[PDB]
Protein backbone atom coordinates (compact mmCIF):
# COMPACT_ATOMS: atom_id res chain seq x y z
CA UNK A 163 0.00 0.00 0.00
CA UNK A 164 3.15 2.13 0.06
CA UNK A 165 6.60 2.12 -1.55
CA UNK A 166 8.85 -0.82 -0.69
CA UNK A 167 12.59 -0.44 -1.49
CA UNK A 168 15.58 -2.78 -1.44
CA UNK A 169 19.28 -1.81 -1.14
CA UNK A 170 22.27 -4.09 -0.39
CA UNK A 171 26.04 -3.76 0.07
CA UNK A 172 28.83 -6.15 -0.90
CA UNK A 173 31.82 -5.84 1.39
CA UNK A 174 35.01 -7.79 1.93
CA UNK A 175 33.84 -10.08 4.74
CA UNK A 176 30.11 -10.20 4.25
CA UNK A 177 27.24 -8.76 2.25
CA UNK A 178 24.33 -7.00 3.85
CA UNK A 179 20.75 -6.39 2.68
CA UNK A 180 18.05 -3.93 3.75
CA UNK A 181 14.39 -3.94 2.64
CA UNK A 182 12.25 -1.10 3.88
CA UNK A 183 9.08 0.89 3.22
CA UNK A 184 9.12 4.67 2.98
CA UNK A 185 7.41 6.54 5.67
CA UNK A 186 4.37 8.58 4.81
CA UNK A 187 4.73 12.29 4.46
CA UNK A 188 7.59 12.13 1.92
CA UNK A 189 9.89 13.07 4.81
CA UNK A 190 12.84 10.99 3.64
CA UNK A 191 12.30 8.46 6.38
CA UNK A 192 11.74 4.75 6.25
CA UNK A 193 10.45 1.87 8.31
CA UNK A 194 12.60 -1.24 8.39
CA UNK A 195 10.88 -4.28 6.87
CA UNK A 196 13.68 -6.84 6.81
CA UNK A 197 17.45 -7.25 7.15
CA UNK A 198 19.87 -9.92 6.00
CA UNK A 199 23.63 -10.61 6.27
CA UNK A 200 25.65 -12.88 3.92
CA UNK A 201 29.09 -14.43 4.61
CA UNK A 202 30.55 -13.80 1.17
CA UNK A 203 34.16 -13.66 2.46
CA UNK A 204 35.48 -12.28 -0.78
CA UNK A 205 38.61 -11.19 1.00
CA UNK A 206 39.38 -14.90 1.39
CA UNK A 207 38.63 -15.55 -2.29
CA UNK A 208 41.32 -13.31 -3.70
CA UNK A 209 44.34 -14.81 -5.38
CA UNK A 210 47.94 -13.70 -5.06
CA UNK A 211 47.53 -11.07 -7.83
CA UNK A 212 44.49 -9.55 -6.12
CA UNK A 213 41.92 -11.16 -8.46
CA UNK A 214 38.64 -12.52 -7.14
CA UNK A 215 38.65 -16.24 -7.76
CA UNK A 216 35.77 -18.06 -9.44
CA UNK A 217 34.93 -19.29 -5.96
CA UNK A 218 34.32 -15.70 -4.93
CA UNK A 219 32.23 -15.28 -8.08
CA UNK A 220 30.17 -18.27 -7.09
CA UNK A 221 29.85 -16.86 -3.58
CA UNK A 222 28.95 -13.38 -4.82
CA UNK A 223 26.27 -14.58 -7.22
CA UNK A 224 24.74 -16.78 -4.56
CA UNK A 225 24.47 -13.86 -2.19
CA UNK A 226 22.79 -11.63 -4.76
CA UNK A 227 20.27 -14.33 -5.65
CA UNK A 228 19.32 -14.72 -1.98
CA UNK A 229 18.86 -10.97 -2.01
CA UNK A 230 16.94 -11.08 -5.32
CA UNK A 231 14.38 -13.58 -4.07
CA UNK A 232 13.74 -11.75 -0.75
CA UNK A 233 12.99 -8.41 -2.42
CA UNK A 234 10.30 -10.15 -4.41
CA UNK A 235 9.00 -11.73 -1.18
CA UNK A 236 8.37 -8.17 0.04
CA UNK A 237 7.23 -6.62 -3.22
CA UNK A 238 10.36 -4.51 -3.22
CA UNK A 239 11.30 -5.12 -6.82
CA UNK A 240 14.77 -4.14 -7.87
CA UNK A 241 17.73 -4.31 -5.50
CA UNK A 242 20.32 -1.60 -5.68
CA UNK A 243 23.77 -3.15 -5.01
CA UNK A 244 26.94 -1.19 -4.19
CA UNK A 245 30.37 -2.85 -3.84
CA UNK A 246 33.43 -1.88 -1.78
CA UNK A 247 36.99 -2.92 -1.22
CA UNK A 248 37.21 -6.47 -2.52
CA UNK A 249 35.53 -5.68 -5.85
CA UNK A 250 36.84 -2.15 -5.91
CA UNK A 251 40.44 -3.41 -5.72
CA UNK A 252 40.18 -6.64 -7.71
CA UNK A 253 41.75 -6.30 -11.22
CA UNK A 254 38.98 -8.56 -12.57
CA UNK A 255 36.24 -6.81 -10.61
CA UNK A 256 34.33 -5.45 -13.58
CA UNK A 257 34.31 -8.83 -15.31
CA UNK A 258 33.09 -10.47 -12.12
CA UNK A 259 30.35 -7.89 -11.79
CA UNK A 260 29.26 -8.27 -15.40
CA UNK A 261 29.20 -12.06 -15.02
CA UNK A 262 27.15 -11.80 -11.84
CA UNK A 263 24.53 -9.64 -13.49
CA UNK A 264 24.16 -12.18 -16.28
CA UNK A 265 23.59 -14.95 -13.70
CA UNK A 266 21.46 -13.07 -11.18
CA UNK A 267 20.19 -9.89 -12.79
CA UNK A 268 21.93 -7.90 -10.05
CA UNK A 269 25.09 -5.90 -10.67
CA UNK A 270 27.48 -5.10 -7.80
CA UNK A 271 28.43 -1.55 -8.68
CA UNK A 272 31.74 -0.41 -7.15
CA UNK A 273 31.83 2.95 -5.30
CA UNK A 274 34.91 4.73 -4.05
CA UNK A 275 35.98 4.44 -0.44
CA UNK A 276 35.10 8.11 0.06
CA UNK A 277 31.47 7.60 -0.95
CA UNK A 278 31.47 4.49 1.28
CA UNK A 279 32.34 6.74 4.19
CA UNK A 280 29.72 9.34 3.37
CA UNK A 281 26.99 6.79 2.97
CA UNK A 282 28.20 4.85 5.99
CA UNK A 283 28.13 8.03 8.02
CA UNK A 284 24.49 8.70 7.05
CA UNK A 285 23.54 5.18 8.07
CA UNK A 286 25.11 5.55 11.49
CA UNK A 287 23.12 8.81 11.79
CA UNK A 288 19.94 6.77 11.46
CA UNK A 289 21.02 4.54 14.37
CA UNK A 290 22.74 6.74 16.97
CA UNK A 291 22.65 10.28 18.39
CA UNK A 292 25.25 12.53 16.70
CA UNK A 293 26.51 15.80 18.03
CA UNK A 294 28.08 18.92 16.54
CA UNK A 295 31.49 17.28 16.06
CA UNK A 296 31.75 13.53 15.33
CA UNK A 297 34.47 11.16 14.13
CA UNK A 298 33.45 7.74 12.78
CA UNK A 299 35.79 4.85 12.13
CA UNK A 300 34.32 2.10 9.93
CA UNK A 301 36.43 -1.07 9.96
CA UNK A 302 35.51 -3.68 7.39
CA UNK A 303 37.27 -6.75 6.13
CA UNK A 304 39.15 -4.79 3.46
CA UNK A 305 39.51 -1.10 4.34
CA UNK A 306 39.17 1.35 7.22
CA UNK A 307 37.24 4.58 6.69
CA UNK A 308 37.65 7.64 8.81
CA UNK A 309 34.76 10.09 8.62
CA UNK A 310 34.31 13.43 10.40
CA UNK A 311 31.15 15.51 10.35
CA UNK A 312 28.45 17.25 12.34
CA UNK A 313 24.78 16.47 13.06
CA UNK A 314 23.69 15.97 9.47
CA UNK A 315 26.44 14.82 7.10
CA UNK A 316 30.08 13.92 6.54
CA UNK A 317 32.66 16.64 6.02
CA UNK A 318 36.12 15.00 5.58
CA UNK A 319 36.57 11.33 4.68
CA UNK A 320 39.70 9.16 4.53
CA UNK A 321 39.88 5.52 3.36
CA UNK A 322 42.87 3.38 4.36
CA UNK A 323 44.01 -0.13 3.38
CA UNK A 324 43.86 -1.31 6.96
CA UNK A 325 41.03 -3.79 6.59
CA UNK A 326 40.90 -6.69 8.94
CA UNK A 327 41.20 -9.47 6.38
CA UNK A 328 43.91 -7.50 4.66
CA UNK A 329 45.93 -7.05 7.80
CA UNK A 330 45.58 -10.65 8.99
CA UNK A 331 47.08 -11.87 5.73
CA UNK A 332 49.68 -9.10 5.74
CA UNK A 333 51.08 -9.97 9.22
CA UNK A 334 51.14 -13.74 9.48
CA UNK A 335 51.22 -14.99 13.03
CA UNK A 336 54.32 -16.85 14.17
CA UNK A 337 54.65 -19.79 16.49
CA UNK A 338 56.37 -18.15 19.42
CA UNK A 339 54.85 -17.70 22.79
CA UNK A 340 54.64 -13.99 22.01
CA UNK A 341 53.72 -14.52 18.37
CA UNK A 342 50.36 -12.94 19.02
CA UNK A 343 51.74 -9.85 20.71
CA UNK A 344 54.13 -9.47 17.80
CA UNK A 345 51.24 -9.53 15.33
CA UNK A 346 49.32 -6.95 17.32
CA UNK A 347 52.41 -4.80 17.66
CA UNK A 348 53.21 -4.96 13.95
CA UNK A 349 49.65 -4.19 12.86
CA UNK A 350 49.63 -1.22 15.16
CA UNK A 351 52.82 0.11 13.55
CA UNK A 352 51.31 -0.12 10.04
CA UNK A 353 48.29 1.84 11.21
CA UNK A 354 50.46 4.64 12.52
CA UNK A 355 52.53 4.80 9.34
CA UNK A 356 49.57 5.17 7.02
CA UNK A 357 47.49 7.36 9.35
CA UNK A 358 50.24 9.71 10.47
CA UNK A 359 50.06 12.25 7.57
CA UNK A 360 46.31 12.84 8.03
CA UNK A 361 45.44 12.07 11.68
CA UNK A 362 44.97 15.69 12.64
CA UNK A 363 42.00 15.79 10.33
CA UNK A 364 40.39 13.19 12.58
CA UNK A 365 42.15 13.83 15.88
CA UNK A 366 40.06 14.42 18.95
CA UNK A 367 39.38 17.99 20.02
CA UNK A 368 37.28 19.15 22.99
CA UNK A 369 33.79 17.63 22.76
CA UNK A 370 34.45 15.22 19.92
CA UNK A 371 32.42 12.01 19.92
CA UNK A 372 33.84 8.82 18.35
CA UNK A 373 31.75 6.15 16.74
CA UNK A 374 32.34 2.67 15.35
CA UNK A 375 30.33 0.62 12.84
CA UNK A 376 30.37 -2.84 11.26
CA UNK A 377 30.87 -6.36 12.44
CA UNK A 378 34.23 -6.12 14.18
CA UNK A 379 33.20 -3.06 16.13
CA UNK A 380 29.85 -4.67 16.92
CA UNK A 381 31.59 -7.88 17.96
CA UNK A 382 33.97 -6.08 20.29
CA UNK A 383 31.11 -4.40 22.16
CA UNK A 384 29.33 -7.72 22.78
CA UNK A 385 32.45 -9.34 24.25
CA UNK A 386 33.17 -6.29 26.40
CA UNK A 387 29.65 -6.17 27.82
CA UNK A 388 29.81 -9.84 28.73
CA UNK A 389 33.10 -9.12 30.49
CA UNK A 390 31.53 -6.21 32.37
CA UNK A 391 28.91 -8.59 33.73
CA UNK A 392 26.33 -7.99 31.02
CA UNK A 393 24.49 -10.56 28.94
CA UNK A 394 25.27 -11.47 25.34
CA UNK A 395 24.07 -8.81 22.94
CA UNK A 396 21.34 -11.11 21.56
CA UNK A 397 19.80 -10.57 24.99
CA UNK A 398 19.21 -6.83 25.41
CA UNK A 399 18.00 -6.94 21.80
CA UNK A 400 20.98 -5.56 19.97
CA UNK A 401 24.30 -3.87 20.49
CA UNK A 402 23.36 -0.53 18.94
CA UNK A 403 24.49 2.43 21.01
CA UNK A 404 26.56 0.57 23.57
CA UNK A 405 29.60 2.45 24.85
CA UNK A 406 32.97 1.10 25.89
CA UNK A 407 36.26 2.74 26.87
CA UNK A 408 39.60 2.65 25.18
CA UNK A 409 40.95 0.97 28.30
CA UNK A 410 38.33 -1.75 28.08
CA UNK A 411 39.21 -2.10 24.42
CA UNK A 412 42.86 -2.38 25.41
CA UNK A 413 42.01 -5.07 27.98
CA UNK A 414 40.08 -7.22 25.50
CA UNK A 415 42.91 -7.35 22.95
CA UNK A 416 45.51 -8.39 25.54
CA UNK A 417 43.39 -11.39 26.50
CA UNK A 418 43.10 -12.45 22.80
CA UNK A 419 46.82 -12.03 22.08
CA UNK A 420 47.71 -14.48 24.87
CA UNK A 421 45.36 -17.08 23.49
CA UNK A 422 46.03 -19.38 20.62
CA UNK A 423 43.65 -19.19 17.64
CA UNK A 424 41.37 -22.17 18.35
CA UNK A 425 40.62 -20.71 21.79
CA UNK A 426 39.89 -17.31 20.26
CA UNK A 427 36.75 -18.89 18.75
CA UNK A 428 35.75 -19.57 22.38
CA UNK A 429 35.94 -15.96 23.65
CA UNK A 430 32.40 -14.90 24.60
CA UNK A 431 31.01 -12.63 21.89
CA UNK A 432 33.77 -13.38 19.29
CA UNK A 433 32.65 -16.91 18.42
CA UNK A 434 31.98 -16.23 14.71
CA UNK A 435 35.04 -14.04 14.04
CA UNK A 436 38.14 -15.81 15.38
CA UNK A 437 40.23 -15.78 12.22
CA UNK A 438 40.70 -12.04 11.76
CA UNK A 439 39.91 -10.76 15.23
CA UNK A 440 43.40 -10.22 16.59
CA UNK A 441 44.39 -7.93 13.74
CA UNK A 442 40.99 -6.24 13.68
CA UNK A 443 41.23 -5.27 17.35
CA UNK A 444 44.80 -4.04 16.90
CA UNK A 445 43.46 -1.81 14.12
CA UNK A 446 40.71 -0.33 16.25
CA UNK A 447 42.99 0.41 19.22
CA UNK A 448 45.78 2.01 17.24
CA UNK A 449 43.50 4.27 15.23
CA UNK A 450 41.37 5.36 18.14
CA UNK A 451 44.44 5.82 20.30
CA UNK A 452 46.12 7.72 17.49
CA UNK A 453 43.11 9.98 17.43
CA UNK A 454 43.03 10.54 21.20
CA UNK A 455 39.73 8.78 21.83
CA UNK A 456 38.87 7.68 25.36
CA UNK A 457 35.40 6.14 24.85
CA UNK A 458 33.26 5.08 21.82
CA UNK A 459 29.68 4.25 20.75
CA UNK A 460 28.85 1.32 18.39
CA UNK A 461 26.26 1.67 15.61
CA UNK A 462 24.36 -1.12 13.97
CA UNK A 463 23.75 1.28 11.13
CA UNK A 464 26.18 1.29 8.26
CA UNK A 465 26.52 1.57 4.46
CA UNK A 466 23.09 0.13 3.53
CA UNK A 467 21.07 2.52 5.70
CA UNK A 468 22.84 5.44 4.02
CA UNK A 469 21.91 4.08 0.60
CA UNK A 470 18.31 4.00 1.71
CA UNK A 471 18.34 7.62 2.86
CA UNK A 472 20.09 8.83 -0.31
CA UNK A 473 17.72 7.10 -2.66
CA UNK A 474 14.67 8.48 -0.86
CA UNK A 475 16.33 11.88 -0.92
CA UNK A 476 16.93 11.58 -4.64
CA UNK A 477 13.39 10.40 -5.40
CA UNK A 478 11.54 12.87 -3.18
CA UNK A 479 13.75 15.79 -4.28
CA UNK A 480 12.96 14.91 -7.90
CA UNK A 481 9.22 14.72 -7.14
CA UNK A 482 9.04 18.25 -5.75
CA UNK A 483 10.30 19.94 -8.89
CA UNK A 484 7.65 18.44 -11.18
CA UNK A 485 4.36 19.96 -12.27
CA UNK A 486 1.06 18.50 -11.13
CA UNK A 487 0.73 16.96 -14.59
CA UNK A 488 4.25 15.59 -14.29
CA UNK A 489 3.56 14.48 -10.73
CA UNK A 490 0.64 12.45 -12.09
CA UNK A 491 3.08 10.84 -14.55
CA UNK A 492 5.23 9.54 -11.73
CA UNK A 493 2.20 8.11 -9.90
CA UNK A 494 0.94 6.43 -13.06
CA UNK A 495 4.37 4.96 -13.63
CA UNK A 496 4.09 3.89 -10.03
CA UNK A 497 0.75 2.27 -10.80
CA UNK A 498 2.60 0.43 -13.60
CA UNK A 499 5.06 -0.99 -11.09
CA UNK A 500 8.05 0.92 -12.45
CA UNK A 501 11.23 1.80 -10.60
CA UNK A 502 10.83 5.44 -9.66
CA UNK A 503 14.50 5.97 -8.78
CA UNK A 504 15.44 4.75 -12.22
CA UNK A 505 12.67 6.84 -13.75
CA UNK A 506 13.70 9.95 -11.85
CA UNK A 507 17.40 9.65 -12.72
CA UNK A 508 16.70 8.99 -16.40
CA UNK A 509 14.45 11.99 -16.52
CA UNK A 510 16.99 14.22 -14.77
CA UNK A 511 19.78 13.15 -17.13
CA UNK A 512 17.51 13.55 -20.12
CA UNK A 513 16.84 17.15 -19.12
CA UNK A 514 20.55 17.60 -18.54
CA UNK A 515 21.36 16.39 -22.09
CA UNK A 516 18.41 18.29 -23.59
CA UNK A 517 19.54 21.53 -21.99
CA UNK A 518 23.10 21.27 -23.23
CA UNK A 519 21.89 20.62 -26.76
CA UNK A 520 19.58 23.67 -26.43
CA UNK A 521 22.43 25.86 -25.21
CA UNK A 522 24.53 24.75 -28.21
CA UNK A 523 22.00 26.02 -30.77
CA UNK A 524 19.82 23.00 -31.41
CA UNK A 525 16.26 23.92 -32.33
CA UNK A 526 13.39 22.12 -30.58
CA UNK A 527 9.65 22.85 -30.36
CA UNK A 528 8.10 24.29 -27.16
CA UNK A 529 6.51 21.11 -25.73
CA UNK A 530 9.57 18.97 -26.47
CA UNK A 531 10.95 19.09 -22.93
CA UNK A 532 7.61 18.12 -21.40
CA UNK A 533 7.22 15.14 -23.73
CA UNK A 534 10.74 13.91 -23.02
CA UNK A 535 10.23 14.16 -19.25
CA UNK A 536 7.10 12.03 -19.29
CA UNK A 537 8.51 9.43 -21.70
CA UNK A 538 11.63 9.24 -19.60
CA UNK A 539 9.43 8.46 -16.62
CA UNK A 540 7.33 6.07 -18.65
CA UNK A 541 10.09 4.37 -20.65
CA UNK A 542 9.75 1.16 -18.60
CA UNK A 543 5.95 0.84 -18.65
CA UNK A 544 5.22 -2.55 -20.19
CA UNK A 545 1.44 -2.06 -20.39
CA UNK A 546 1.56 0.82 -22.90
CA UNK A 547 3.90 -1.06 -25.30
CA UNK A 548 -3.75 12.92 -16.97
CA UNK A 549 -2.92 16.46 -18.11
CA UNK A 550 -1.40 16.12 -21.64
CA UNK A 551 -3.27 16.57 -24.97
CA UNK A 552 -3.71 13.68 -27.45
CA UNK A 553 -1.08 14.64 -30.03
CA UNK A 554 1.36 15.07 -27.16
CA UNK A 555 0.50 11.71 -25.58
CA UNK A 556 0.86 9.90 -28.90
CA UNK A 557 4.19 11.65 -29.28
CA UNK A 558 5.15 10.58 -25.75
CA UNK A 559 4.14 6.99 -26.33
CA UNK A 560 6.03 6.97 -29.61
CA UNK A 561 9.07 8.51 -27.94
CA UNK A 562 8.79 6.04 -25.06
CA UNK A 563 8.63 2.85 -27.23
CA UNK A 564 10.86 3.97 -30.10
CA UNK A 565 12.49 1.41 -32.38
CA UNK A 566 13.99 1.62 -35.82
CA UNK A 567 11.50 -1.06 -36.86
CA UNK A 568 8.02 0.24 -35.88
CA UNK A 569 6.03 -2.42 -34.00
CA UNK A 570 3.05 -2.09 -36.41
CA UNK A 571 4.40 -2.37 -39.96
CA UNK A 572 3.57 0.67 -42.17
CA UNK A 573 1.20 -1.13 -44.51
CA UNK A 574 -0.41 -2.89 -41.55
CA UNK A 575 -3.70 -1.38 -40.19
CA UNK A 576 -3.50 0.96 -37.16
CA UNK A 577 -0.04 2.15 -38.09
CA UNK A 578 0.16 5.51 -36.37
CA UNK A 579 1.82 8.04 -38.65
CA UNK A 580 2.52 11.35 -37.00
CA UNK A 581 3.01 14.42 -39.15
CA UNK A 582 6.53 14.78 -40.59
CA UNK A 583 7.60 17.31 -37.98
CA UNK A 584 6.32 15.00 -35.27
CA UNK A 585 8.12 12.00 -36.74
CA UNK A 586 11.30 14.12 -36.65
CA UNK A 587 10.63 15.25 -33.10
CA UNK A 588 10.13 11.71 -31.87
CA UNK A 589 13.49 10.63 -33.23
CA UNK A 590 15.43 13.55 -31.81
CA UNK A 591 13.90 13.26 -28.35
CA UNK A 592 14.14 9.47 -28.37
CA UNK A 593 17.87 9.72 -29.13
CA UNK A 594 18.36 11.87 -26.06
CA UNK A 595 16.37 9.45 -23.95
CA UNK A 596 18.53 6.47 -24.95
CA UNK A 597 21.76 8.03 -23.72
CA UNK A 598 20.23 8.96 -20.37
CA UNK A 599 18.83 5.47 -19.94
CA UNK A 600 22.25 4.14 -20.64
CA UNK A 601 23.70 6.47 -18.05
CA UNK A 602 21.67 4.92 -15.26
CA UNK A 603 21.81 1.44 -16.69
CA UNK A 604 23.30 0.30 -13.41
CA UNK A 605 20.50 1.88 -11.36
CA UNK A 606 22.98 3.63 -9.11
CA UNK A 607 21.31 7.00 -9.35
CA UNK A 608 24.81 8.42 -9.32
CA UNK A 609 25.48 9.54 -12.91
CA UNK A 610 25.59 13.30 -13.76
CA UNK A 611 26.30 15.12 -17.05
CA UNK A 612 29.39 17.32 -16.51
CA UNK A 613 30.15 18.69 -20.04
CA UNK A 614 28.61 18.10 -23.47
CA UNK A 615 30.38 19.84 -26.21
CA UNK A 616 30.45 19.80 -29.96
CA UNK A 617 33.54 18.10 -31.43
CA UNK A 618 33.42 18.66 -35.18
CA UNK A 619 30.13 17.29 -36.53
CA UNK A 620 29.76 15.24 -33.33
CA UNK A 621 29.62 15.61 -29.57
CA UNK A 622 31.81 14.81 -26.61
CA UNK A 623 30.03 13.98 -23.38
CA UNK A 624 31.72 14.12 -20.04
CA UNK A 625 29.96 12.20 -17.33
CA UNK A 626 30.77 11.31 -13.77
CA UNK A 627 29.34 8.67 -11.53
CA UNK A 628 29.24 6.11 -14.27
CA UNK A 629 30.01 2.44 -13.92
CA UNK A 630 31.56 0.40 -16.68
CA UNK A 631 28.04 -0.96 -17.27
CA UNK A 632 26.69 2.56 -17.62
CA UNK A 633 29.50 3.58 -19.97
CA UNK A 634 29.02 0.53 -22.16
CA UNK A 635 25.27 1.06 -22.11
CA UNK A 636 25.71 4.60 -23.42
CA UNK A 637 27.96 3.28 -26.15
CA UNK A 638 25.27 0.75 -27.10
CA UNK A 639 22.15 3.01 -27.13
CA UNK A 640 23.48 6.18 -28.73
CA UNK A 641 23.05 4.88 -32.23
CA UNK A 642 19.90 6.97 -32.63
CA UNK A 643 21.67 10.02 -31.15
CA UNK A 644 24.27 9.56 -33.86
CA UNK A 645 21.62 9.50 -36.63
CA UNK A 646 20.08 12.76 -35.37
CA UNK A 647 22.86 14.69 -33.67
CA UNK A 648 26.13 13.18 -34.84
CA UNK A 649 28.91 11.06 -33.38
CA UNK A 650 29.14 11.14 -29.60
CA UNK A 651 32.26 10.36 -27.66
CA UNK A 652 31.83 9.89 -24.01
CA UNK A 653 34.62 10.40 -21.64
CA UNK A 654 35.63 9.78 -18.08
Ligand SMILES: [Mn+2]
Nearest residue numbers: 504541542599
Ligand atom coordinates in the same frame (compact mmCIF):
# COMPACT_ATOMS: atom_id res chain seq x y z
MN1 LIG B 1 15.37 1.65 -18.07
